[PDB]
């Protein structure tokens, strides 16, 4: 029945995203053939990494713009690309493309970041996280050695990711979960509330049934995830606040227009 939906959404997911839990876990431990990630654990190694990742942040006055802002920029890039893959994924969702474009750009405005930190958990571990498509790995310790509030930005994401990864969801769970977070019929400024809601009931149900069969033993996993949706919501709130600070107490770290309008009049 709605099961052809589950596979529907999962196909869109596997297509629209370049990195996925499956690869993330193979990289973050498992050498096999070869290609062990370069570790950015301090300033020296950071510059070493940028030297390759730019010929733009290594020899353009940016080679010496506070490290915190250089990093803030790289993360900014990841958001833009992800917000982009997230848009296609949503359009490939049965019903989304039939809604009023304004309701679309409303669901994407409030769910895009909840989604980001969710999928990002895939590439994180208690010690750090993969960067640059799995080529690098930046330590959790190096990020807390930055000056405030930059050193306070990821720690909460690491705590959430550690509890979130324990649920051991796989890519299929995550596709439905992400669709569930994006098709939230409780967003502000929503015009056609009625429909978005039923859409939600649909995917959530599908997800419930999916986890029920995929993870028969985690029993209360569906409710665990429901809680994590609320958790992601608060994380976003905190993160947005953390950024408003920087944005006005660190004029050197500007935000991309796309991200500028998402944060713009958010919470």
């Amino acid at each position: 029945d709605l099961k052809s939906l589950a596979k529907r959404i999962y196909e869109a997911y596997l297509k629209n995203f370049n990195m996925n839990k499956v690869k993330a876990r193979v990289i973050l431990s498992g050498k096999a053939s070869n290609n062990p990630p370069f570790v950015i654990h301090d300033m020296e190694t950071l510059c070493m990494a940028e030297k390759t990742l730019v010929a733009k942040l290594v020899a353009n006055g940016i080679q010496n713009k506070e490290a915190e802002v250089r990093i803030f920029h790289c993360c900014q890039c990841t958001s833009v690309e992800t917000v982009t893959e997230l848009t296609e994924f949503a359009k490939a969702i049965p019903g989304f493309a039939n809604l009023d474009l304004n309701d679309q750009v409303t669901l994407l405005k409030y769910g895009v970041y909840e989604a980001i930190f969710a999928m990002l958990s895939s590439v994180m571990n208690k010690d750090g996280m993969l960067v640059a498509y799995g080529n690098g790995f930046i330590t959790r310790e190096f990020l807390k050695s930055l000056r405030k509030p930059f050193c306070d930005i990821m720690e909460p994401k690491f705590d959430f990711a550690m509890k979130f990864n324990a649920l051991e969801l796989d890519d299929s769970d995550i596709s439905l979960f992400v669709a569930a977070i994006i098709c939230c019929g409780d967003r502000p400024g929503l015009l056609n509330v009625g429909h978005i809601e039923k859409m939600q009931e649909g995917i959530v149900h599908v997800l419930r049934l999916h986890l029920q069969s995929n993870h028969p033993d985690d029993i209360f996993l569906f409710p665990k995830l429901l809680q994590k949706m609320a958790d992601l919501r608060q994380l976003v709130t905190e993160h947005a606040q953390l950024v408003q600070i920087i944005k006005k107490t660190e004029s050197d770290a500007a935000l991309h227009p796309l991200l500028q309008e998402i944060y713009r009049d958010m919470y």
Binding site: T87, K91, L101, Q104, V105, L108, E261, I262, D265
Partner: peptide
């Protein structure tokens, strides 16, 4: 608000 970019990205690409 505005969201002039989110629109441009929902069209088709």
């Amino acid at each position: 608000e505005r969201h002039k970019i989110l629109h441009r990205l929902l069209q088709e690409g």
